[PDB]
Amino acid sequence: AQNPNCNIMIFHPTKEEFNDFDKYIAYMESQGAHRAGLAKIIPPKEWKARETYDNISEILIATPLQQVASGRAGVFTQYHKKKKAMTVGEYRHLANSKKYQTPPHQNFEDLERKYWKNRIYNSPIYGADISGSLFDENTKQWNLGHLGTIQDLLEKECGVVIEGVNTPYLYFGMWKTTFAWHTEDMDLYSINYLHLGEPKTWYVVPPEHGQRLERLARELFPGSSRGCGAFLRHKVALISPTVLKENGIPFNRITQEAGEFMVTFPYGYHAGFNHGFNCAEAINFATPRWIDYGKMASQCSCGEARVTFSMDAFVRILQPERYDLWKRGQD
Ligand SMILES: O=C(O)CNC(=O)C(=O)O
Ligand SMILES: [Mg+2]
Ligand code: NI
Ligand SMILES: [Zn+2]
Numbered sequence: 001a002q003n004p005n006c007n008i009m010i011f012h013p014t015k016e017e018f019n020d021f022d023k024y025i026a027y028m029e030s031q032g033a034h035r036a037g038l039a040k041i042i043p044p045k046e047w048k049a050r051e052t053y054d055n056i057s058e059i060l061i062a063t064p065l066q067q068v069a070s071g072r073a074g075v076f077t078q079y080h081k082k083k084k085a086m087t088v089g090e091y092r093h094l095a096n097s098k099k100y101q102t103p104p105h106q107n108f109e110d111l112e113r114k115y116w117k118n119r120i121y122n123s124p125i126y127g128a129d130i131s132g133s134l135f136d137e138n139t140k141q142w143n144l145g146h147l148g149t150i151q152d153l154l155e156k157e158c159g160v161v162i163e164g165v166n167t168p169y170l171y172f173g174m175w176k177t178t179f180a181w182h183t184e185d186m187d188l189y190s191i192n193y194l195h196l197g198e199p200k201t202w203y204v205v206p207p208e209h210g211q212r213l214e215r216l217a218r219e220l221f222p223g224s225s226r227g228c229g230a231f232l233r234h235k236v237a238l239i240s241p242t243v244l245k246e247n248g249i250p251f252n253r254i255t256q257e258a259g260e261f262m263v264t265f266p267y268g269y270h271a272g273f274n275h276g277f278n279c280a281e282a283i284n285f286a287t288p289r290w291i292d293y294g295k296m297a298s299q300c301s302c303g304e305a306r307v308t309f310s311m312d313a314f315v316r317i318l319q320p321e322r323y324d325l326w327k328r329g330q331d
Contacts (some may be wrong), residue, residue, distance in 0.1 A: 002032030013042075041263060069119060078236055092277055130170045134279070167283070179271055192263075200275065266294075302329060305329075
């Protein structure tokens with residue numbers, strides 16, 4: 001078996017290798033990349049997502065989210081308080097203010113220590129889930145707006161045509177902005193490009209050990225767990241690396257910088273935080289290997305997780321038994 005310790009692998013494709021997305025994903029998995037739940041992809045030195053980022057300030061963040069924490073330093077939930085719309089220009093100015101800016105620090109390690117020590121005493125503001133793309137339409141390789149769709153993958157694999165479309169989202173982050181422990185909708189893959197600014201640190205549990213994370217989570221968030229059999233889909237729960245180590249949960253960590261891609265793999269639980277002002281673009285995708293994970297994916301039926309129009313059809317085809325009760329959580 002390739003990558004038996006489930007380490008995060010880093011790839012350096014040539015411009016020749018960078019022409020065929022599907023085939024490069026298949027290559028990475030032949031080297032065991034998926035076992036980690038997360039891989040880093042450094043694009044060829046010749047490749048650019050777009051010419052410059054000089055004209056992005058007028059993008060609107062219609063619903064900025066203030067991330068308010070409750071709990072203890074290493075075990076907390078966050079809720080999202082809706083704030084008034086601002087442009088990316090205004091947001092960037094906010095992220096750089098004395099109140100929200102990244103603090104003085106030695107290295108990613110000193111910064112990580114400060115994040116986990118101090119996160120809960122602050123409420124950073126995230127621009128999340130904004131429909132759009134910053135890839136130049138002339139960028140032909142690894143353009144997240146031009147990937148093959150999940151609906152076409154399902155159709156090629158299973159012979160059934162379904163409704164739905166699949167488009168990218170932009171995330172604008174600042175210091176301490178946080179992504180809670182989760183897998184993707186329907187345990188899909190994701191791909192994430194950090195377009196500009198400060199880094200993003202990621203924690204990930206190998207897919208083969210995901211259930212151990214879930215079991216710890218049921219113990220750490222006992223009331224959430226009683227309310228919903230898949231409460232991690234609410235994307236509110238945080239657990240520090242110290243707490244994970246204390247409980248024997250296998251995981252890994254890696255820091256993404258501007259200009260790099262990350263791929264998350266089916267059923268790879270991940271979480272993280274932003275080091276300062278940045279902009280990332282992400283989208284879900286599928287391969288033939290995803291189909292079985294889609295069929296087994298846990299669902300939120302308490303009605304908190306509330307998920308896309310396109311997800312309906314996945315549940316309808318892949319999980320016809322769940323499909324009655326699930327859309328009751330959606331309606
Ligand atoms: O970048 C973020 O804040 C969240 N993105 C993801 O969880 C992802 O790409 O899978
Ligand atoms: Mg603009
Ligand atoms: Ni994700
Ligand atoms: Zn739920």
